[PDB]
Design an enzyme around this catalytic site. Structure first.
Site, PDB file in Angstrom:
ATOM      1  N   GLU A   1       0.832  -1.195   0.000  1.00 31.67           N
ATOM      2  CA  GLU A   1       0.000   0.000   0.000  1.00 31.67           C
ATOM      3  C   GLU A   1       0.868   1.247   0.000  1.00 31.67           C
ATOM      4  O   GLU A   1       1.959   1.266   0.582  1.00 31.67           O
ATOM      5  CB  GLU A   1      -0.926   0.015   1.211  1.00 31.67           C
ATOM      6  CG  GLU A   1      -1.848  -1.181   1.264  1.00 31.67           C
ATOM      7  CD  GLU A   1      -2.930  -1.024   2.298  1.00 31.67           C
ATOM      8  OE1 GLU A   1      -2.643  -0.460   3.371  1.00 31.67           O
ATOM      9  OE2 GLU A   1      -4.063  -1.475   2.042  1.00 31.67           O
TER      10      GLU A   1
ATOM     11  N   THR B   1      -8.380   1.225 -19.549  1.00 28.85           N
ATOM     12  CA  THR B   1      -8.160  -0.109 -19.039  1.00 28.85           C
ATOM     13  C   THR B   1      -6.930  -0.555 -19.824  1.00 28.85           C
ATOM     14  O   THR B   1      -6.555   0.080 -20.807  1.00 28.85           O
ATOM     15  CB  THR B   1      -9.327  -1.036 -19.336  1.00 28.85           C
ATOM     16  OG1 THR B   1      -9.614  -1.015 -20.738  1.00 28.85           O
ATOM     17  CG2 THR B   1     -10.542  -0.605 -18.555  1.00 28.85           C
TER      18      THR B   1
ATOM     19  N   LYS C   1      -8.089  -3.948 -23.313  1.00 28.42           N
ATOM     20  CA  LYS C   1      -8.873  -3.955 -24.540  1.00 28.42           C
ATOM     21  C   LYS C   1      -7.943  -3.831 -25.739  1.00 28.42           C
ATOM     22  O   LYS C   1      -7.164  -4.736 -26.006  1.00 28.42           O
ATOM     23  CB  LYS C   1      -9.909  -2.834 -24.515  1.00 28.42           C
ATOM     24  CG  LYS C   1     -10.935  -3.002 -23.398  1.00 28.42           C
ATOM     25  CD  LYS C   1     -12.016  -1.939 -23.469  1.00 28.42           C
ATOM     26  CE  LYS C   1     -12.999  -2.075 -22.328  1.00 28.42           C
ATOM     27  NZ  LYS C   1     -12.304  -1.918 -21.023  1.00 28.42           N
TER      28      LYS C   1
END
Ligand SMILES: Nc1nc2c(c(=O)[nH]1)N(C=O)[C@@H](CNc1ccc(C(=O)N[C@@H](CCC(=O)O)C(=O)O)cc1)CN2
Ligand SMILES: Nc1nc2c(c(=O)[nH]1)N(C=O)[C@@H](CNc1ccc(C(=O)N[C@@H](CCC(=O)O)C(=O)O)cc1)CN2
Ligand SMILES: Cc1ncc(COP(=O)(O)O)c(CNCC(=O)O)c1O
Ligand SMILES: Cc1ncc(COP(=O)(O)O)c(CNCC(=O)O)c1O
Lengths: 417, 416
Positions: free
Chosen positions: B56, B225, B228
């Site tokens: 994190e 994204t 694709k």
């Protein structure tokens, strides 16, 4: 045509070198981060499969794309095994993570602005349980609750707050609490005011699966968990429930998709399926038992060595070491231990005078070393080395000596043989 | 834990389903516009031990110890994302396109703010304002669609912008075949002091190859994204250029600890190598074939008498309106599927049916192109599709076409 022989090594040296070093680091470091583990090669195999190429929005049998006959089987396997392992009649395996799983629950049961009773972060609660810097604290009205001076949840005070603020939902669960939460008692409190009892068992899922820790499924209206902590699976979220209505389950499914996510990660879900099967093995049960035993063995040493352990002990896989009286920040301790190849994580403690990035404590968990082969003897010796470092945090010679000892025990307990 | 552990001898059921999917990807012609075939390099990264690390925070500023190497991995992804798109800011942690968009919304807006986004039926994505998505539930959405010509009317868009004074205008789509004028949208946004947010998820690969206008220099924030047209792992990405340090800090915080917990480092490693592959010269010729193949298929559909929304395409996809043929997208999808031609039912502008039924199908060429298909094969394929649609109830027709796709699929293997 993509040659199945294309690899990262001969194509991207920079990336490959980093990956190989992490691979070695996982062997040469003692990982004591409570939220980490070592997933099996079976899980990694699933995550590296071609299921990553498929878009499969919706649920098995009711998709938004064609060609989902086989990924449907994969998802159903994960769903069925999740239900059998925890005794739930409902399961959603699509959440990308614990945070996404929790977000789905919030949006399925509440309206922006509703009042929620959750455990304060410094006292052991997770970010998604009400932190003002997380979506949970920003979208809802959070009323926090913490622990006693004894280091335990005061259900009497909890009941008072519940009756006074009349929250619409009460969250049970934690990221850094070493005790046993009375799920049934929390359900009572929730019922008295007609609130929902939402339990996030991310940290103890593995223990619950083995029967080493109380199962919240039969007491909460909804339960969420990650699959990568004590459950030792791939990184991801999961939603579980029992005895709820079809309407409640429909809302939960919608909250995940199209509510908060798009397409699910089928390769990761395949990983969840095999991980859930491994969690059913008898050896998994003895493994969780060692995990709890090792945590206790380490606490003893810390107490003997004069260190403050929040709650005075542990009933699970982790424990917090309050360093306020030692005049040390979790950030310092974390860095010093790291130089000795002992990896932990700085962690806030109840009434921490420092901010979350600095902290006044460290959190210690035994899932990784236990999965690695460690038993009480090794766990006790390790706790000792940790205290040696903390005692002489500025003595480079002490740190060097300990480092050599860990590189040594690490060579005898390989992670991946 | 022993390296020799595997799924085959331990979990036969799962392994059998996985193997069938592996074969299905070879025996089916995938025409789902949002799918592709990522390289074995990306899969290799996703199956690595980076899955074991909690990291994190951001490189050099983590919340856990032992992140020296995953830091290098994430930095590689960040640097390559910036160079490929010409951005000075990049966040590679979003788990998906939806999570990436959620971060943008929460970083720039307050619950209830007004947003101008493209309506779903007209080509917009769920996260662009749908009432069943968090976007439509948390914000005040004013929709905008396309002309009777099938294109965005920037004049009407400007009117709406001036009338509703939205705090943010969203550009981007899931099912629009045209070229969006990013600069024009920025003008409109500036005229009212609104943020221009562009979601280029579908055209990222084309943009990377220079085959489609890059929105990065016109929008305040861009998301995409990586799975694709970019042909990488499933995941999200945030990009920006010319923004302030304050804006970038907000975006980083919106991702974490705002909307996500720990990132998926193994997936991020996949993003890093995928972004490097997108820099290859062959990747550029690949995107060009993708666009060319899409056009070749549209011609056939028009000749065969089918309605193509917008009358054509300038990217990798196109919508086929089946209202006049008295067919639902659900029927067409199922019929084509029986002939091993996989598409997805899709809403069309002014669709009389609901999203699960629809009155159209969406077709994309990224997968068949990555597979080796060129105009000749693309045209022949479009023909077979029309043959099935013409005689949607003739099992004999479907059987013949099926034999044909199995035949051509054998000559163009996906993975060897
Ligand atoms: N009790 C507890 N421990 C835990 C977690 C948790 O949620 N709860 N985490 C679960 O993953 C990790 C810690 N994650 C955290 C990440 C950000 C902030 C935070 O409040 N950051 C603020 C202020 C930071 C500063 O000190 O400068 C911010 O980013 O603005 C806190 C904890 C590990 N330990
Ligand atoms: N224009 C467009 N096409 C796209 C997408 C999109 O976002 N926009 N998708 C991007 O992934 C996929 C379709 N995803 C969708 C998923 C759910 C709903 C939806 O509105 N469902 C409602 C009502 C369903 C019904 O008809 O019964 C619901 O679930 O309540 C719509 C599209 C593929 N095609
Ligand atoms: C109780 C709890 N709930 C949800 C999450 C969220 O999971 P993701 O990181 O996959 O979003 C965590 C993670 N906690 C990490 C830690 O304690 O270090 C958690 O501890
Ligand atoms: C413009 C756009 N934005 C965001 C997303 C969200 O991505 P994830 O599925 O990874 O959340 C999609 C996905 N669209 C899928 C499709 O068009 O079929 C999209 O098309």
């Amino acid at each position: 045509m993509l040659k199945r022989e294309m690899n990262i090594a001969d194509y991207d040296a920079e990336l490959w070198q980093a990956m190989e070093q992490e691979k070695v680091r996982q062997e040469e470091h003692i990982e004591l981060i409570a939220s980490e583990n070592y997933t099996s090669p079976r899980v990694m195999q699933a995550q590296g499969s071609q299921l990553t190429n498929k878009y499969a929005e919706g649920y098995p049998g009711k998709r938004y794309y064609g060609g989902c006959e086989y990924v449907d089987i994969v998802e159903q396997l994960a769903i069925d095994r999740a239900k059998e392992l925890f005794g739930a009649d409902y399961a959603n395996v699509q959440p990308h993570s614990g945070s996404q799983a929790n977000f789905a629950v919030y949006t399925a049961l509440l309206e922006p602005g509703d009042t929620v009773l959750g455990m304060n972060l410094a006292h052991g609660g997770h970010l998604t349980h009400g932190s003002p810097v997380n979506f949970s604290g920003k979208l809802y009205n959070i009323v926090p609750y913490g622990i006693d001076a004894t280091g335990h949840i005061d259900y009497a005070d909890l009941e008072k707050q519940a009756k006074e603020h009349k929250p619409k939902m009460i969250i049970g669960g934690f990221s850094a609490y070493s005790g046993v939460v009375d799920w049934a008692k929390m359900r009572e409190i929730a019922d008295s005011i007609g609130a929902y009892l939402f339990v996030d068992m991310a940290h103890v899922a593995g223990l619950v699966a083995a029967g080493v820790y109380p199962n919240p499924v039969p007491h909460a209206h909804v339960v969420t968990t990650t699959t990568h902590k004590t459950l030792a699976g791939p990184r991801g979220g999961l939603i579980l429930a029992k005895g709820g209505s079809e309407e409640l389950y429909k809302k939960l499914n919608s909250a995940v998709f199209p509510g908060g996510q798009g397409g699910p990660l089928m390769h990761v879900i395949a990983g969840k399926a095999v991980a859930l099967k491994e969690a059913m093995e008898p050896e998994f049960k003895t493994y969780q038992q060692q995990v709890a035993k090792n945590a206790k063995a380490m606490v003893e040493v810390f107490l003997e060595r004069g260190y403050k352990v929040v709650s005075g002990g542990t009933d699970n896989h982790l424990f917090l070491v309050d360093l306020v009286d030692k005049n040390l920040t979790g950030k310092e301790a974390d860095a010093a231990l790291g130089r000795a190849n002992i990896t932990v994580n700085k962690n806030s403690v109840p009434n921490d005078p420092k901010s979350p990035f600095v902290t006044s404590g460290i959190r210690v968990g035994t899932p990784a070393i236990t999965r690695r082969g460690f038993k009480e003897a090794e766990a006790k010796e390790l706790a000792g080395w940790m205290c040696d470092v903390l005692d002489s945090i500025n003595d480079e010679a002490v740190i060097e000596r300990i480092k050599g000892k860990v590189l040594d025990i690490c060579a005898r307990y390989p992670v991946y043989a």
